[PDB]
Amino acid sequence: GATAVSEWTEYKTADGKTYYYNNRTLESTWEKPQELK
């Protein structure tokens, strides 16, 4: 009964969008991760 929070950095591209690059197994996330808590 525990949740996980991965490496959620800020890798915002030239779109002005905050893109997250997850160091899970090395993952990318466009918006706020499902595990962003």
């Binding site: 890798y11 915002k12 591209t13 893109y19 690059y21 990318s28």
Partner: peptide, 9 residues
């Protein structure tokens, strides 16, 4: 120098 971003999927 600063790192380049990967493009997101």
């Amino acid at each position: 120098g600063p790192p380049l971003i990967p493009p997101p999927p």
